Amino acid sequence: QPISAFERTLSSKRSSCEYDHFLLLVEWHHDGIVEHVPLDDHMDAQHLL
Amino acid sequence: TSKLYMLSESPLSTKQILQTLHALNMLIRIRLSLYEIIPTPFQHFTIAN
Amino acid sequence: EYQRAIDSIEECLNKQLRLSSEKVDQYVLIENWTSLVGHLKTLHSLISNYTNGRELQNEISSLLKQDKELDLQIQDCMREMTSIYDTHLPKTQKVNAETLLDYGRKLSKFSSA
Amino acid sequence: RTHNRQMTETLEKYKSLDFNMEKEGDVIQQLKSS
Amino acid sequence: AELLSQQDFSILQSRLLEFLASQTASKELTLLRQGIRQLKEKVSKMEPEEMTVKEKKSIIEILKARIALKKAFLKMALS
């Protein structure tokens, strides 16, 4: 996930944005389309399906 | 070669090693307060035992 | 969106010149004007927006500088307390001179070239 | 000796001794609020 | 002579008015066209440079909260 321009400005010293950081995410494919689906941290795979 | 193969006397003062620990923890506080880079998710830390 | 508003202003102007040259019809012309006036109002609200956001952002730079300075002040105070308390690791018989001196003089020939 | 005097004086300058500091942290939060 | 301020907007509007009141060829219109040219080049030199103006306000306020807490803590140790 790219850093927010505003996150970067706020970040300073101990709170640092400079850490390379990323999330886990899903996008379900559909004939001719792609949609990003929010992923609950407590999501059974069955529940997602 | 002495210093690499040297080995200390086998007694370790357990009161000493506590005081090492105190000075060590204390020294990580020193470091961390003036350690340049903390990631923001790490901003809360405990200097343990 | 700036260039779109301004281009629209230009266009309204040239269309107005075109209208006046051809013939006078009150409606067409006054509607042209008031469309141009609307686009001018959107242009203005937008530029006052930009100057506002910019002056706010300069305020941000001054305030960020203030935060950095305060961080450096807490830095300095902790630095000085930890300097004063110098932190050291813990440390990892008496002699009679006679036996000492005799031993050293023995050793003198043997540690010497 | 010099180190110990320096330590006593730096300790006296900053002295704000306390226990159960959580109460003082939240007291400081509502102080900052006002 | 370049800065993208409100004053040069009001310059534009005054040029427009003066054109309208002036009305084959026009010396007031050509001045107007110089003006819109200038503003066009001022917007072409323009750079987007955008972070959210709402976010801008919010970070002004939480940063100011930071600063006030900083001074509070500092003066706390000095006492």
From Swiss-Prot, chain B:
It comes from the Eukaryota. It is found in: Nucleus. Component of the Mediator complex, a coactivator involved in the regulated transcription of nearly all RNA polymerase II-dependent genes. Mediator functions as a bridge to convey information from gene-specific regulatory proteins to the basal RNA polymerase II transcription machinery. Mediator is recruited to promoters by direct interactions with regulatory proteins and serves as a scaffold for the assembly of a functional preinitiation complex with RNA polymerase II and the general transcription factors. Component of the Mediator complex. Belongs to the Mediator complex subunit 14 family. This is Mediator of RNA polymerase II transcription subunit 14. It comes from Schizosaccharomyces pombe (strain 972 / ATCC 24843). The gene is med14. The chain holds residues 138 to 186 of 879 of the full protein.
UniProtKB/Swiss-Prot annotation, chain C:
Coiled coil: none annotated. It is found in: Nucleus. Belongs to the Mediator complex subunit 4 family. Component of the Mediator complex. Component of the Mediator complex, a coactivator involved in the regulated transcription of nearly all RNA polymerase II-dependent genes. Mediator functions as a bridge to convey information from gene-specific regulatory proteins to the basal RNA polymerase II transcription machinery. Mediator is recruited to promoters by direct interactions with regulatory proteins and serves as a scaffold for the assembly of a functional preinitiation complex with RNA polymerase II and the general transcription factors. This is Mediator of RNA polymerase II transcription subunit 4. It comes from Schizosaccharomyces pombe (strain 972 / ATCC 24843) (Fission yeast).
UniProtKB/Swiss-Prot annotation, chain D:
Signal peptide: none annotated. It is found in: Nucleus. Component of the Mediator complex, a coactivator involved in the regulated transcription of nearly all RNA polymerase II-dependent genes. Mediator functions as a bridge to convey information from gene-specific regulatory proteins to the basal RNA polymerase II transcription machinery. Mediator is recruited to promoters by direct interactions with regulatory proteins and serves as a scaffold for the assembly of a functional preinitiation complex with RNA polymerase II and the general transcription factors. Belongs to the Mediator complex subunit 7 family. Component of the Mediator complex. This is Mediator of RNA polymerase II transcription subunit 7. The lineage of its organism: Eukaryota, Fungi, Dikarya, Ascomycota, Taphrinomycotina.
Swiss-Prot record, chain E:
One of its GO terms (molecular function) is transcription coactivator activity. One of its GO terms (cellular component) is mediator complex. GO terms for biological process: positive regulation of transcription initiation by RNA polymerase II. This is Uncharacterized protein C24C9.04. The lineage of its organism: Eukaryota, Fungi, Dikarya, Ascomycota, Taphrinomycotina.
